[PDB]
Protein backbone atom coordinates (compact mmCIF):
# COMPACT_ATOMS: atom_id res chain seq x y z
CA UNK A 1 0.00 0.00 0.00
CA UNK A 2 1.19 3.54 -0.69
CA UNK A 3 0.09 6.85 0.81
CA UNK A 4 1.43 10.34 0.15
CA UNK A 5 0.99 12.59 3.16
CA UNK A 6 1.23 16.40 3.16
CA UNK A 7 2.41 18.37 6.21
CA UNK A 8 -0.41 18.85 8.74
CA UNK A 9 -0.21 21.13 11.75
CA UNK A 10 -1.56 24.37 13.19
CA UNK A 11 1.91 25.85 12.66
CA UNK A 12 4.16 26.06 9.53
CA UNK A 13 7.16 24.40 11.19
CA UNK A 14 7.53 22.50 14.43
CA UNK A 15 9.91 20.42 16.52
CA UNK A 16 10.52 16.96 15.12
CA UNK A 17 11.26 15.92 18.69
CA UNK A 18 8.38 17.20 20.80
CA UNK A 19 5.57 16.80 18.30
CA UNK A 20 4.46 13.85 16.18
CA UNK A 21 2.27 15.08 13.35
CA UNK A 22 0.67 11.74 12.77
CA UNK A 23 0.78 8.05 13.38
CA UNK A 24 0.74 5.17 10.94
CA UNK A 25 -1.44 2.22 11.86
CA UNK A 26 -1.34 -1.28 10.41
CA UNK A 27 -4.13 -3.46 11.75
CA UNK A 28 -5.24 -6.96 10.78
CA UNK A 29 -8.98 -6.43 10.44
CA UNK A 30 -9.40 -9.84 8.79
CA UNK A 31 -6.92 -12.20 10.52
CA UNK A 32 -4.18 -14.08 8.71
CA UNK A 33 -5.01 -17.68 7.96
CA UNK A 34 -3.51 -20.49 5.91
CA UNK A 35 -3.37 -24.27 5.86
CA UNK A 36 -0.56 -25.78 7.86
CA UNK A 37 2.33 -26.60 5.55
CA UNK A 38 2.28 -23.21 3.85
CA UNK A 39 4.91 -20.63 4.80
CA UNK A 40 4.05 -19.41 8.32
CA UNK A 41 6.52 -16.50 8.48
CA UNK A 42 4.56 -13.65 6.88
CA UNK A 43 6.45 -10.38 7.46
CA UNK A 44 5.28 -6.80 7.06
CA UNK A 45 7.82 -4.15 6.11
CA UNK A 46 7.63 -0.41 6.28
CA UNK A 47 9.51 1.87 3.93
CA UNK A 48 9.04 5.63 4.19
CA UNK A 49 10.39 8.66 2.42
CA UNK A 50 10.10 12.17 3.70
CA UNK A 51 9.17 14.66 0.98
CA UNK A 52 10.04 18.34 0.73
CA UNK A 53 11.98 18.26 3.99
CA UNK A 54 12.78 21.73 5.34
CA UNK A 55 14.67 22.59 8.52
CA UNK A 56 15.37 25.85 10.35
CA UNK A 57 16.64 27.29 13.60
CA UNK A 58 20.15 25.86 13.44
CA UNK A 59 22.03 25.27 16.70
CA UNK A 60 23.79 22.27 18.28
CA UNK A 61 22.40 18.74 18.11
CA UNK A 62 19.65 17.81 20.57
CA UNK A 63 18.32 14.22 20.85
CA UNK A 64 15.23 15.22 22.88
Amino acid sequence: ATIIVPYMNTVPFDSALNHCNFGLLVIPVVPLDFNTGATSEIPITVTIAPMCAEFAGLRQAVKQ
Binding site: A1, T2, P6, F13, P50, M51
Partner: protein
Amino acid sequence: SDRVAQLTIGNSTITTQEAANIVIAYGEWPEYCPDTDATAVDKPTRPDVSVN
Protein backbone atom coordinates in the same frame (compact mmCIF):
# COMPACT_ATOMS: atom_id res chain seq x y z
CA SER B 1 -2.13 -1.87 -15.28
CA ASP B 2 -2.41 0.34 -12.14
CA ARG B 3 -0.91 -2.43 -10.09
CA VAL B 4 2.28 -2.28 -12.25
CA ALA B 5 4.54 0.59 -11.09
CA GLN B 6 7.85 2.11 -9.99
CA LEU B 7 8.46 5.23 -7.89
CA THR B 8 11.87 6.82 -7.54
CA ILE B 9 13.07 9.46 -5.11
CA GLY B 10 16.63 10.16 -4.04
CA ASN B 11 18.95 7.20 -4.68
CA SER B 12 16.10 4.78 -3.95
CA THR B 13 13.49 3.09 -6.12
CA ILE B 14 10.49 0.94 -5.29
CA THR B 15 8.87 -1.36 -7.85
CA THR B 16 5.32 -2.28 -6.86
CA GLN B 17 3.11 -4.51 -8.97
CA GLU B 18 0.37 -5.95 -6.75
CA ALA B 19 -0.42 -2.33 -5.88
CA ALA B 20 -3.90 -1.01 -5.13
CA ASN B 21 -3.11 2.33 -6.75
CA ILE B 22 -1.86 5.25 -4.66
CA VAL B 23 -3.54 7.50 -2.15
CA ILE B 24 -2.88 11.20 -1.86
CA ALA B 25 -4.00 12.13 1.62
CA TYR B 26 -6.77 14.73 1.65
CA GLY B 27 -6.06 15.27 -2.04
CA GLU B 28 -2.92 17.33 -1.46
CA TRP B 29 0.65 17.03 -2.50
CA PRO B 30 3.54 17.77 -0.14
CA GLU B 31 5.13 21.15 -0.75
CA TYR B 32 7.78 23.40 0.75
CA CYS B 33 6.25 26.04 3.02
CA PRO B 34 5.01 29.16 1.11
CA ASP B 35 6.08 32.67 2.13
CA THR B 36 2.58 33.78 3.17
CA ASP B 37 2.24 30.97 5.71
CA ALA B 38 5.89 31.15 6.87
CA THR B 39 6.74 32.89 10.12
CA ALA B 40 10.35 32.12 11.08
CA VAL B 41 12.69 34.54 9.31
CA ASP B 42 15.91 32.57 8.92
CA LYS B 43 16.60 30.92 5.56
CA PRO B 44 15.67 27.24 5.81
CA THR B 45 17.95 24.46 4.59
CA ARG B 46 16.44 22.09 2.01
CA PRO B 47 18.88 19.09 1.83
CA ASP B 48 16.90 17.43 -0.95
CA VAL B 49 18.36 14.03 -2.01
CA SER B 50 20.18 13.22 1.24
CA VAL B 51 16.88 13.36 3.16
CA ASN B 52 14.04 12.99 0.64
